[PDB]
């Protein structure tokens, strides 16, 4: 599909199957892309997985997953907020939106036709906070040259 990176480079990537958009110290964003028709280099998103990693005193680990024709307004455990009932540092509102205030991060997910779209707003210091081995992150470095 089309990708707009944190570095404002716009790319058209095939990236078929499961690919990490974000893989950092605070968040995991994983997508599944499918060829629009068999054998096509044009691909589109049928699954969006977001892992909000455990943040002591703010949220327990939460997982969001949307697929084509299934965009819930809750995490996989049926919760709509992280941690306790009083803890609103992490919440979901119906676009379905995820507000991770604790990491100044917003994630918007919607279904446009048969496929899914994604928009992520993240603070620069947190977006660039990742370990050496976390070098595959479509949002940071874009796609491998062979995928474009």
């Amino acid at each position: 599909p089309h990708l707009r990176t944190f570095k404002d480079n716009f790319q058209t990537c095939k990236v078929e199957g499961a690919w990490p958009l974000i893989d950092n110290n605070y968040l995991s964003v994983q997508v599944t892309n499918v060829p629009v028709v068999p054998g096509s280099s044009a691909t589109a998103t049928n699954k969006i997985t977001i892992i909000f990693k455990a943040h002591h005193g703010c949220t327990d680990q939460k997982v969001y997953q949307a697929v084509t024709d299934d965009l819930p307004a809750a995490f996989v455990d049926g919760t709509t907020s992280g941690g306790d009932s009083d803890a609103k540092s992490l919440r979901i509102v119906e676009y379905v939106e995820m507000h991770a205030r604790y990491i100044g991060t917003t994630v918007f997910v919607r279904q446009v036709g048969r496929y899914l779209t994604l928009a992520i707003r993240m603070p620069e210091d947190l977006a660039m906070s990742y370990e050496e081995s976390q070098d595959l992150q479509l949002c940071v470095n874009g796609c491998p040259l062979s995928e474009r």
């Binding site: 990708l3 703010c58 803890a87």
Partner: peptide, 15 residues
């Protein structure tokens, strides 16, 4: 207290 500056944006869409 939990609450986190410049923002970076990422997008993925069709076609």
């Amino acid at each position: 207290p939990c609450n986190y500056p410049s923002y970076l944006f990422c997008g993925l869409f069709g076609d």
